[PDB]
Design a protein around this ligand. Structure first.
Ligand SMILES: CC1CCN(C(=O)Cn2nnc3ccccc32)CC1
Ligand SMILES: CC1CCN(C(=O)Cn2nnc3ccccc32)CC1
Lengths: 304, 304
């Protein structure tokens, strides 16, 4: 029992972190096989970042201008290419610690762990979610760029995020490992406002099921609702509309607890309309939306 | 910017996890040098756990009765001894992945990361605190025993906790790496109630400083207080009494923000007396107490 915001063990990803320096800029790189992936803005001086023409800036850079250090040892750069907003640095040595891996572009609402790094060294690991407005609410300081987000299924690491920027609002934006930004953000030091940060309804429901499984039951009520009725309330509270796909994904949680998905939707509707009344659910005074139904199942079953 | 409940990177600890089986019981072990540490209750059958005489039960066990498997390979057990509530299994091979390490007994209020494991394999990592009643609020299922808590300072892992049990209230109890339980708990399946779970005042104040550093300032008020006046309010709200030692430890946060410790105490006093009024601080609707002043400094400075 007990339910925590748990991250994946970071060891497999720690073995991939390297430091990348170009000119006066240093950030993190991800070394997989004989390729080091990093944000293309490593070629930018602080002034370049205001209005960069990455193609033009890259022309002035040769393989020897990218300094890649793995631990206390330098990697030889034998090639470089720009794919979207990431640079791919071909090195002469395959990472001996390369785990089994995939590059995956996640959907909003999906969660992942971040290994925050500085100078190619890990500082910490935390769990977060891709918000519906394609930002993440991380913990990143200057130098954290190139830090990655990932999920792990048994022995395969699926990298889903690479950190690139902080918006003026203090929220974070980044790319998948093919260098494509999540959302409309561009790697430019220009004011970019985020859209509405709606609540991930299916995740709140999964977390309510997690709460029932762990003994927190006070919020269970005598009501039920329909998807349409629930969605009228969800719209009013800036919650994502719930679909039959979300109901299907909550099936195993509904089966384990014996609480029908629509009954849990009615509990959530009452919590939205009445608030918590100073009460808590799994040590939280607000409705938690950064646990997917898969996260709840994995944590409650002990998947390794 | 951004502030997360961050855990230490778990890689150094993942390299130490092993599976220990004795009879029909399987749990986790910590392999450091040529010694494997695990909860002594691994020698217990489910019936033994009700009223175990560990000394008598251990007599019936020989080195060959403890099966230690590291990954897919078996370690040879050449010795065994019981130290308090942990077993020390001497193996014929030193763990090649042994990091620099220390065994430390932490004080209530101190935080650490837990690498939850099942069958010697890691499932996840999360950050928690030793509660003032010497319990921890973790996420542990049957088979998680032997999972460890730790802190990391640069390259040295300080192990502070080993998981042993879940109380009937769903909270967790365990030992330091010398096998001494935190608090009054015993490794017996007998009802053991926890004492008052008071709030770690110095940690709440550190988290309020973290909130100011990250832009959340709405709770800053025009008041100040004294240690004695603040402590009258803290007693009323089941908060730990604040001492000059706590004020001293908050010094660097007070200096960075320019907000005197007693002014922050006055802000906290108003938050205790008035509540949050539906507002949030660093994405939380309650006062967070599982970040130490050292955690706030480390996260806000990017220590690797
Ligand atoms: C193109 C250019 C945009 C601006 N920028 C960043 O925002 C980098 N960054 N990322 N996370 C941060 C947290 C604190 C400070 C800076 C941070 C650099 C690259
Ligand atoms: C002496 C004897 C006491 C009872 N006991 C435990 O509580 C073990 N344990 N630890 N974490 C758990 C989470 C879920 C279920 C069981 C759990 C086994 C050892």
């Amino acid at each position: 029992s007990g339910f925590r915001k748990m991250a994946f063990p970071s060891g497999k990803v720690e073995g991939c972190m390297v430091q990348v320096t170009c000119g006066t800029t240093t950030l993190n790189g991800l070394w997989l096989d004989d390729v080091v992936y990093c944000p293309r803005h490593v070629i930018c001086t602080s002034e370049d970042m205001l209005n960069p023409n990455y193609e033009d800036l890259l022309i002035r850079k040769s393989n020897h201008n990218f300094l890649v250090q793995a631990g206390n040892v330098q990697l030889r750069v034998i090639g470089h290419s720009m794919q979207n907003c990431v640079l791919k640095l071909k090195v002469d040595t395959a990472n001996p610690k390369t785990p089994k891996y995939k590059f995956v572009r996640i959907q909003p609402g999906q969660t992942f762990s971040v290994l925050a790094c500085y100078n190619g060294s890990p500082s910490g690991v935390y769990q977060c979610a891709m918000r519906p407005n394609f930002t993440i609410k991380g913990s990143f300081l200057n130098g954290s760029c190139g830090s990655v987000g990932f999920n792990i299924d048994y022995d395969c690491v699926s990298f889903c995020y690479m950190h690139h920027m902080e918006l003026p609002t203090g929220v974070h934006a980044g790319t998948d490992l093919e260098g494509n930004f999540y959302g409309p953000f561009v790697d430019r030091q220009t004011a970019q406002a985020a859209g509405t940060d709606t609540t991930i309804t299916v995740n709140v429901l999964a977390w309510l099921y997690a709460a029932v499984i762990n003994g927190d039951r006070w919020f269970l009520n005598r009501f039920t609702t329909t998807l349409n009725d629930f969605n009228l309330v969800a719209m009013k509270y800036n919650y994502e509309p719930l679909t039959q796909d979300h109901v299907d994904i909550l099936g195993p949680l509904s089966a384990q607890t014996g609480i029908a998905v629509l009954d849990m939707c009615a509990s959530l509707k009452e919590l939205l309309q009445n608030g918590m009344n100073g009460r808590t659910i799994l040590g939280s005074a607000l409705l938690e939306d950064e646990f997917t139904p898969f996260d709840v199942v994995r944590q409650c079953s002990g998947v390794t």
